Amino acid sequence: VRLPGLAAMRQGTRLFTPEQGEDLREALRRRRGSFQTTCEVTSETTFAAARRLREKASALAALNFASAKNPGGGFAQAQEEDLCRGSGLYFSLTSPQAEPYYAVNRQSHSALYTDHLIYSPQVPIFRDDAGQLLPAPVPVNIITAPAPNAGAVAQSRPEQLPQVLPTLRERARRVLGVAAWMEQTHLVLGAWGCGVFRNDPAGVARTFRELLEGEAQGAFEHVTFAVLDNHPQHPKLGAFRRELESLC
Ligand SMILES: Nc1ncnc2c1ncn2[C@@H]1O[C@H](COP(=O)(O)OP(=O)(O)OC[C@H]2O[C@H](O)[C@H](O)[C@@H]2O)[C@@H](O)[C@H]1O
């Protein structure tokens, strides 16, 4: 039998296309200055920050460090694999509405990908970081979008290297523009693009920091950066703490 919440979530899944970029900015701009934005940088998983924020959260959204080409990225280290194995996310990512995002991204034949985002409403989290049931599932809205594959660019088309950073910059602003458009209060962000895709965690953490200080200033209530980091140097975790000190 199908798990509770899946049908509602899949049917509410919705595609944002590149041609709606200006719609997303106007939503951000209109929402600027609405709160005293509280923000933190943590070492929790993306669904652990979500799950503790839930009971406090008017409108809770989290970012999927998604594949551009296959829902769930075809599958252990990776965060989207984590979200798919412990929630209904996959059932939403394979939905009919969502298909143009993978179809176009594959057709682009560019490691920078395109500007489609998938909005999955009320995705039920079913299991903890350790994989047993939750009391009851806890729903979270999930914004899925692919960071540019900086690794692939370096190895397959270095000529797009200078475009890497502007691409992640404008796509992040679409990411929070979707969160503003869907009127979220609590945003779970993190080391977007910084693992498999090999983006500089310094640039990523900062690019956020700029937007939460510029166009996204005050647009959200609480923004936590859940950055899992089991590497002893804690490189990703450190660059996010080091560079989000102004805002938190
Ligand atoms: N559950 C987690 N929660 C929070 N942070 C995490 C988690 N898991 C890893 N991190 C941290 O986040 C950093 C980046 O996690 P990555 O998963 O590589 O996302 P990308 O954007 O770089 O690559 C996306 C591709 O990887 C997948 O295959 C997708 O299908 C895509 O194909 C990690 O180094 C962790 O420190």
Author numbering: 29 to 103, 107 to 279
Kindly provide excerpts from the paper associated with this entry.
The crystal structures of T267R and T267K belonged to the space group P3221. In consistent to the secondary structure analyzed by CD spectrum, the substitution of the residue did not cause dramatic alterations to overall structure compared with the wild-type enzyme with root mean square deviation to wild type of 0.50 and 0.43 Å for T267R and T267K, respectively. The superposition of the modeled PAR trimer and the DrPARG T267K structure showed that the n + 1 unit was blocked by the barrier resulted from ionic pairing of side chains of Lys267 and Asp260 and implicated that the ionic bonding might be sufficient for establishing the steric hindrance of the exo-glycohydrolase mode. PARG cleavage assay in vitro showed T267R and T267K mutants with decreased hydrolysis PAR activity as compared with the wild-type enzyme. Since T267R and T267K DrPARG catalyze the hydrolysis of PAR without generating short-chain PAR but oligo ADP-ribose, the establishment of endo-glycohydrolase activity was not solely accounted from the lack of steric hinderance near 2′-OH.
Despite the abundance of PARP1, most of the PAR generated by DNA damage is rapidly degraded, with a half-life of less than 1 min by poly (ADP-ribose) glycohydrolase (PARG). Our study demonstrates that DrPARG is involved in catalyzing the breakdown of endogenous PAR and DNA repair in D. radiodurans. From observing the structural peculiarities of DrPARG, we show that although previously thought to be an obligate exo-glycohydrolase, bacterial PARG could exert both exo- and endo-glycohydrolase functions.
